[PDB]
Amino acid sequence: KLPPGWEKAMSRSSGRVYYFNHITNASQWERPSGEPARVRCSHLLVKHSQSRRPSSWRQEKITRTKEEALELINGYIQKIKSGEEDFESLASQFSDCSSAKARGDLGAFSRGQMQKPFEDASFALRTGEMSGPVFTDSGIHIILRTE
Ligand SMILES: OCc1ccc2nsnc2c1
Numbered sequence: 572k573l574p575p576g577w578e579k580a581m582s583r584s585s586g587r588v589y590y591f592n593h594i595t596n597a598s599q600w601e602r603p604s605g606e607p608a609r610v611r612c613s614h615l616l617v618k619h620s621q622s623r624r625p626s627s628w629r630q631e632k633i634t635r636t637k638e639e640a641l642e643l644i645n646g647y648i649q650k651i652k653s654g655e656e657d658f659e660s661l662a663s664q665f666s667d668c669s670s671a672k673a674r675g676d677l678g679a680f681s682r683g684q685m686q687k688p689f690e691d692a693s694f695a696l697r698t699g700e701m702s703g704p705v706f707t708d709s710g711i712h713i714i715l716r717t718e
């Protein structure tokens with residue numbers, strides 16, 4: 572009926588239906604449109620105190636909580652979806668991954684090289700699509716599939 576991992580849902584404030592993808596954690600109002608060896612993604616990582624390495628080029632000692640980290644991710648997603656800010660601009664300034672220097676880009680990759688929730692989401696995104704918050708041992712990700 573619907574593409575991989577999508578379900579119908581109802582907005583709690585509106586009452587109108589919307590669509591949600593439990594693999595990528597994306598949500599939209601529109602019924603989603605319509606697998607390759609490799610995909611190409613960029614991402615924005617917000618680490619927290621339980622990240623595998625609680626440190627980054629932005630902070631020698633990352634001390635925020637997972638909940639605080641999720642709030643930061645949600646903020647960026649709002650600004651990206653509203654158009655006030657571009658994904659590349661926010662990655663470049665705020666991602667705790669060193670890939671921030673490259674506007675968040677990671678290159679292309681196959682299944683089995685990335686952490687699994689990141690890989691599942693990356694491969695479930697269509698080209699040009701953004702994910703919701705995705706959780707890994709590194710922290711909370713916003714993923715943009717570019718190829
Ligand atoms: O940390 C992994 C990673 C991957 C791609 C990059 N481009 S620039 N810095 C990078 C870092």
Ligand SMILES: OCc1ccc2nsnc2c1
Nearest residue numbers: 669670673676677678684
């Ligand atoms: O996965 C580690 C990694 C991968 C690609 C890179 N380009 S430049 N720095 C990098 C680091």
